[PDB]
Amino acid sequence: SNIIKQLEQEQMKQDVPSFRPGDTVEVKVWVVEGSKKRLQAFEGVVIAIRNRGLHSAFTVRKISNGEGVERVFQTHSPVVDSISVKRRGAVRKAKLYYLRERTGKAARIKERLN
Amino acid sequence: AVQQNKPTRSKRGMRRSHDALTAVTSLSVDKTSGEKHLRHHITADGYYRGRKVIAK
Amino acid sequence: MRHRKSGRQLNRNSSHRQAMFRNMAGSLVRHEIIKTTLPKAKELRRVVEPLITLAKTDSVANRRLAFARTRDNEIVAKLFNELGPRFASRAGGYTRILKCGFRAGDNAPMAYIELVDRSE
Amino acid sequence: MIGLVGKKVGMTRIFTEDGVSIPVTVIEVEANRVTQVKDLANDGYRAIQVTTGAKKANRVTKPEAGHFAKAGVEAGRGLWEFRLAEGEEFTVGQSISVELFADVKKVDVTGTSKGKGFAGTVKRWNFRTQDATHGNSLSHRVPGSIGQNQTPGKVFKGKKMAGQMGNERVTVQSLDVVRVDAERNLLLVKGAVPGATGSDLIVKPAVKA
Amino acid sequence: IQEQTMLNVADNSGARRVMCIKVLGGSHRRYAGVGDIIKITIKEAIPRGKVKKGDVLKAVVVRTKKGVRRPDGSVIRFDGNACVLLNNNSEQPIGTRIFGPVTRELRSEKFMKIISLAPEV
RNA sequence: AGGACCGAACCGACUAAUGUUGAAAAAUUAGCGGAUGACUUGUGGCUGGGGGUGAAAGGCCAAUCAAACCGGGAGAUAGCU
RNA sequence: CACAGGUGGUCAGGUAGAGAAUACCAAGGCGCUUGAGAGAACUCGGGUGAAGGAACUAGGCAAAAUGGUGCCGUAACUUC
RNA sequence: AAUUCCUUGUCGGGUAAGUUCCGACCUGCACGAAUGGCGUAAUGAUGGCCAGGCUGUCUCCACCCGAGACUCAGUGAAAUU
RNA sequence: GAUGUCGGCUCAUCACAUCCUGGGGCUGAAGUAGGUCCCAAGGGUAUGGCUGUUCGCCAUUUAAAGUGGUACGCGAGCUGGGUUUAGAACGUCGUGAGACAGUUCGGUCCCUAUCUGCCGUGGGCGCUGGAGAACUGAGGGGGGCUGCUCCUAGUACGAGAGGACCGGAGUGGACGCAUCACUGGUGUUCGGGUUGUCAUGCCAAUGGCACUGCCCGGUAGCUAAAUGCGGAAGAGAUAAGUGCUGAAAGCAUCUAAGCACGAAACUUGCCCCGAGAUGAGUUCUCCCUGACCCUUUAAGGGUCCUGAAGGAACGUUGAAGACGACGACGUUGAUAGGCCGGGUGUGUAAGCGCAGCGAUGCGUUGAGCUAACCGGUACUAAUGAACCGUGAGGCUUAACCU
Ligand SMILES: [Mg+2]
Ligand SMILES: [Mg+2]
Ligand SMILES: [Mg+2]
Ligand SMILES: [Mg+2]
Ligand SMILES: [Mg+2]
Ligand SMILES: [Mg+2]
Ligand SMILES: [Mg+2]
Ligand SMILES: [Mg+2]
Ligand SMILES: [Mg+2]
Ligand SMILES: [Mg+2]
Ligand SMILES: [Mg+2]
Ligand SMILES: [Mg+2]
Ligand SMILES: [Mg+2]
Ligand SMILES: [Mg+2]
Ligand SMILES: [Mg+2]
Ligand SMILES: [Mg+2]
Ligand SMILES: [Mg+2]
Ligand SMILES: [Mg+2]
Ligand SMILES: [Mg+2]
Ligand SMILES: [Mg+2]
Ligand SMILES: [Mg+2]
Ligand SMILES: [Mg+2]
Ligand SMILES: [Mg+2]
Ligand SMILES: [Mg+2]
Ligand SMILES: [Mg+2]
Ligand SMILES: [Mg+2]
Ligand SMILES: [Mg+2]
């Protein structure tokens, strides 16, 4: 802890934007594909949330080809690269798992707006 | 489940070889008073490690 | 396994093991001295100090919150006003235990929980 | 070669340039000081005894302080033998550090254990549980049938059945060495070694490939 | 994923409900996922399609609820278990189209014909 | 209107667990069936043993029933232990 | 037995409720005549469980589930 | 078939796979007409089979809250031998 | 004067007439695959549908789904489906009561373990002066499974089709251990929402009870589904086997002399226990070097003065733990609690202000509260003593030394 946390505070990336259990964010992660190594983006909605130092995640809900998908990113993972926000929203909660049963009109979340 | 043979009075004694009681390793006394009290806690009236807590 | 688990359950449901301390707490804040069980004492300890530490500030919420726990506007008054300033400088150890143990009915070990500044 | 005594506390990650979050147990080697050398003329075997900690010099028996004095005294959690071959060390605290490792990918790591105690089959033997319903009287998670009958007579030894689980050497073998960064007295491995932090460990080069 | 277990069709022909009747890959093999072959049994099927209820073939688990984790630990999960039926005799899909996003875990020489269809990852 | 419907009291007793040197010589707990009727309940009465009563199981007739309990014939008889 | 059983009649407050259900209370009466610690296996009674969902088993045993009022609406068959 | 010994009869249905189940055949060991024959809406804590829902029933068990178990103080059994 | 039946469950243990994997001989053995016999028991050796089944048939797997002994292993361990009680019915037999090695629906499964035996864990004493440590390692146990892909090599072999050996590399299934860093579970000790009702005079704010009342999320810890590692190589001696040189036996021959290879078996290597290893071992360090008497004399016994090393006791406690045990600390202090700061978790308190008739909304405010966590801090509790344990260590011989 006192010896550790150093090897963490030494790894932890300081290049990370704000967040919220309602924001959209567009995580841009690597891919490698085959012989290439592009940068895949992930447009979703933060439901769960990190906060554990070097170890941290956001868990984003997307719902691609008519099928709901959920991904848990490791914030300080070199494969995370960048991470936008796109849209922040008002939730009034810390974990929006009550969204795994919503969909359009019901899954709607009023934007943040300050 | 019951005994098949009446346990000799000897066997009984051996079983009670660990039942023996323990002394007290000698108890301490107080400074302010000659209180022959137990180690770490209040004397017969209100003393302990010198001083004198607990009114009367 | 209890590995690294804090808190003593004594021998009852949290429900009970809350008000029994809530009473024993205000009880201490009152007579400033009590003769309870050693374990039941080294417990009441980290239940009143947090209250006194809370009594450090007059406030108007820490007062209500002080009323939340220990439902006694009587003692909440004793706190903030008395023990409040009484230990306004006290680091943290506002209690003593003064052992004695050995009760009649039960060989249970008793103890003398008391505010550090109780002697007059 | 020989090994070094350390203290557990690790369990973290180290992201690779590629993108791998490698697990890791942060062992701390405060450099071991050979408190005594053992020869085959005054012992019967080539061994080295070292130390690493630092006793408060208050809880150390004189017979201990006298032992340290006999050599390069400097207290220490305790003593630790290290069978060596074809290579000796200076009887005096030759002060060996984590640098002892580097081109050594082996490692074993030997901690105390977990400490369950409670035991009870199914948890310390991975036994099976009998239908939690469909009848079964007071015989859910229980041993059930430990022997056979008259022919056998008794209950064969080794017969698994509850009893203290934990507190026992147990090594790990293999385990890669992430970083052998001395200076700060550190040694990182792939991860997962006995102990629960602070527990004395004996990390040495793997005996197997 | 384990005996029984109802999965969805990630391709076409004989869609909907299809029960897994055996997890291939070795003795006492517990469950399956990511991109493993599974013994299926068409339970719904469409009126036309290419396969009809009752058929006993094999399929690849394209999606699972548990998900899949990659090095860093980051996991990817889907709300439902989808799979793709493949010719019993010699692997490879039987459908002409694959529905829903798959995982890069199927980028294997064999499970190639699928990762090359619309969706993603 | 109803040997009608749902459901407390009240009556009953299909299932499971626990109890089995029980809290209890048949119960406790969670469910369950009837619940204006061939219903249920208090008090008192009348049927007596080869007899009674029985929507019939040999069921009940005072923790006893293919013939009650008590006293007697009686120290039945026992080629058996 | 100072026994978790049995025992007929009368009375019938407040909030919510169809209600003598039920939950919280009034009047009133109680904490059940061994207690104090600990926080083991295992037994008993419960709460929550990833993915699967009867694969359990003689048997879905036990659990889980359903649960109200109003309205929409409702098959074979029928002694209507 | 609450009736079939050979018996898991034969065929069809349901299932990935059905000694059970449902629909048939008739070779009824040994159905059959008030010790009633074949049907029958409704009813059933009735026997068998299936399905949806549901789940720790199970894969495979994990954690947690309480009553014991363990410790101390008081009282203090049992069968058996 | 009672040894509970079949099947299932749970847990097994042994045999070898071996199912798989390993080593070989012959083959009507091209290869790949087989056939049969010899050796080999290390390890491994299927989920379901039907039925009470065991078995069996069937579906689908696997490297394989071995045979058998163990009261047809296992009920003072579980089940109670089959099967012998009492209810009832069918077919059948009998005048009938009733009956069936026919069927059918229903039908109480007790025991707090004294002894042996196992699994754990202590308390004595003994190891010959007493201690604190570190070892040595006689022995004992644990583990021993295996698929697929690739390279060799599309080569050997083959008409092709097909397709190796040998050796090497990678990744899996099942199993075992460990550990919570990751993914998650739990988390009635943390935060919040909410239904009914009671109370704190009322508003407001709160608390009790209703499964934690119902519910949402969740710290530490514990966890598996999570994650990391492991059944190896290599040695010795071999099995079956293959043989060399070789006479009896002018040749021949694996053997009689004499030599060499040879398998998951055996010994070892790997991990754990381990000197009660009474054959009680070893090395390092530490401590005790005052006086007298009775003596029935090497045998002592007893007195006063002395009490060391270390231990134990008590207290604060632990990722240790049923209790003992083991570990840390005791003012020469961070061992617990509290306290400070942070983290985390919830999710923007109360009060006040403002907008709306109002429910309520916005602002202050991302607030408030926040545990077992991290960093630190003597505020409280860990009192001077006291208790145990002694006072130079038997003889005989040898080696030195004097
Ligand atoms: Mg409550
Ligand atoms: Mg029972
Ligand atoms: Mg014998
Ligand atoms: Mg009626
Ligand atoms: Mg009714
Ligand atoms: Mg009467
Ligand atoms: Mg009677
Ligand atoms: Mg006579
Ligand atoms: Mg007589
Ligand atoms: Mg009483
Ligand atoms: Mg679940
Ligand atoms: Mg089944
Ligand atoms: Mg089965
Ligand atoms: Mg049920
Ligand atoms: Mg229920
Ligand atoms: Mg079925
Ligand atoms: Mg029929
Ligand atoms: Mg007839
Ligand atoms: Mg009739
Ligand atoms: Mg007791
Ligand atoms: Mg007692
Ligand atoms: Mg053989
Ligand atoms: Mg079978
Ligand atoms: Mg048997
Ligand atoms: Mg029994
Ligand atoms: Mg039966
Ligand atoms: Mg009968």
mmCIF file of N, CA and C (backbone and C1' of nucleotides) and ligand atoms in Angstrom, chain G residues 2-4 32-34, ligand 10:
data_model
loop_
_atom_site.group_PDB
_atom_site.id
_atom_site.type_symbol
_atom_site.label_atom_id
_atom_site.label_comp_id
_atom_site.label_asym_id
_atom_site.label_seq_id
_atom_site.Cartn_x
_atom_site.Cartn_y
_atom_site.Cartn_z
ATOM 1 P P A G 2 -45.008 -28.168 38.664
ATOM 2 O "O5'" A G 2 -45.234 -26.761 37.952
ATOM 3 C "C5'" A G 2 -46.459 -26.455 37.290
ATOM 4 C "C4'" A G 2 -46.283 -25.219 36.440
ATOM 5 C "C3'" A G 2 -45.062 -25.320 35.490
ATOM 6 O "O3'" A G 2 -45.313 -24.521 34.334
ATOM 7 C "C1'" A G 2 -44.721 -23.594 37.088
ATOM 8 P P C G 3 -46.326 -25.046 33.196
ATOM 9 O "O5'" C G 3 -45.722 -26.438 32.706
ATOM 10 C "C5'" C G 3 -44.416 -26.513 32.139
ATOM 11 C "C4'" C G 3 -44.434 -27.317 30.855
ATOM 12 C "C3'" C G 3 -45.330 -26.873 29.686
ATOM 13 O "O3'" C G 3 -44.597 -27.058 28.479
ATOM 14 C "C1'" C G 3 -45.725 -29.147 30.189
ATOM 15 P P A G 4 -44.030 -25.783 27.682
ATOM 16 O "O5'" A G 4 -45.319 -25.112 27.026
ATOM 17 C "C5'" A G 4 -46.106 -25.813 26.065
ATOM 18 C "C4'" A G 4 -46.499 -24.889 24.935
ATOM 19 C "C3'" A G 4 -47.292 -25.559 23.804
ATOM 20 O "O3'" A G 4 -48.082 -24.529 23.214
ATOM 21 C "C1'" A G 4 -45.230 -24.751 22.970
ATOM 22 P P C G 32 -38.520 -13.644 30.674
ATOM 23 O "O5'" C G 32 -39.305 -15.024 30.795
ATOM 24 C "C5'" C G 32 -40.599 -15.081 31.388
ATOM 25 C "C4'" C G 32 -41.497 -16.005 30.601
ATOM 26 C "C3'" C G 32 -40.981 -17.412 30.282
ATOM 27 O "O3'" C G 32 -41.166 -18.285 31.390
ATOM 28 C "C1'" C G 32 -42.129 -16.488 28.407
ATOM 29 P P U G 33 -39.923 -19.129 31.957
ATOM 30 O "O5'" U G 33 -39.386 -18.261 33.182
ATOM 31 C "C5'" U G 33 -38.140 -17.575 33.087
ATOM 32 C "C4'" U G 33 -37.123 -18.213 34.005
ATOM 33 C "C3'" U G 33 -37.297 -19.718 34.234
ATOM 34 O "O3'" U G 33 -36.033 -20.355 34.104
ATOM 35 C "C1'" U G 33 -37.216 -18.566 36.317
ATOM 36 P P U G 34 -35.749 -21.293 32.830
ATOM 37 O "O5'" U G 34 -34.171 -21.492 32.833
ATOM 38 C "C5'" U G 34 -33.324 -20.538 32.203
ATOM 39 C "C4'" U G 34 -32.397 -19.921 33.216
ATOM 40 C "C3'" U G 34 -31.481 -18.841 32.669
ATOM 41 O "O3'" U G 34 -32.152 -17.589 32.683
ATOM 42 C "C1'" U G 34 -30.230 -20.365 33.984
HETATM 43 MG MG MG J 10 -42.091 -21.110 33.146
#
